[PDB]
Amino acid sequence: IVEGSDAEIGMSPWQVMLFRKSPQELLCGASLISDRWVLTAAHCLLYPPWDKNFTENDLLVRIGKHSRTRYERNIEKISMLEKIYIHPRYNWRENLDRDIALMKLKKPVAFSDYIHPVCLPDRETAASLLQAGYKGRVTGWGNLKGQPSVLQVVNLPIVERPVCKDSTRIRITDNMFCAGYKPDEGKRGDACEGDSGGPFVMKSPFNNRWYQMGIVSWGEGCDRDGKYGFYTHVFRLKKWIQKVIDQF
């Protein structure tokens, strides 16, 4: 995250951090959708041009974390992965269409004040909320480096589809949307590399619930310069999510 503010304790209790085991390194964000299922971007797990092709035993997640560098005794939880499922039509060669993956935890995580699942959108919530100008939220650690670094938050407006299309060389698909402020400056917060895979959430005023509308897709460092971040459209991929969970 860049140009965010400090998240409050318990503010994003579905936030999941994905780590390489060896050597230990933060790879991506992710989200808790049940006590056993975690959502992330496919490119966090599989990106052949960079020799990236993780198996379950390569990885771990930490859940309930607020501070990047402080161990939070009795609060943060660690889990290993039973299985990774990448969308079979994930298009890593060209535009990262269907940039989505599911990870099953080896054992369920216990819910707490700090650990709690986010909702997947239903049709009416997606129809109501996925509109240009409406703001969603991304959370991650200060991809600016430093010392204390607690979870950061940025709230970003959904961008008009033609404006998105004109901002990039890539062929954008209906399975993606873009968010962020204009160059001429509404604000200047954004999701970064490292925030990739994390959730883009929106709060329904109708029922007071947080819904995961997007997954943070590809970013390099925090320089998009003139560009906008792209997000996997979770609702459009919801039947795939349900298929995987119901079968496995």
């Binding site: 503010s5 318990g10 209790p13 959708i33 699942p117 997947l120 929106m202 709060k203 619930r209």
Partner: peptide, 28 residues
């Protein structure tokens, strides 16, 4: 699932976070 999206330290306690109003105000 039943309880999804309702945060123990916020919605469940009738407390709002510092910037959620920014989201709700954008939904015009």
């Amino acid at each position: 699932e039943a309880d999804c999206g309702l945060r123990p330290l916020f919605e469940k306690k009738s407390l709002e976070d510092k910037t959620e109003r920014e989201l709700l105000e954008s939904y015009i």
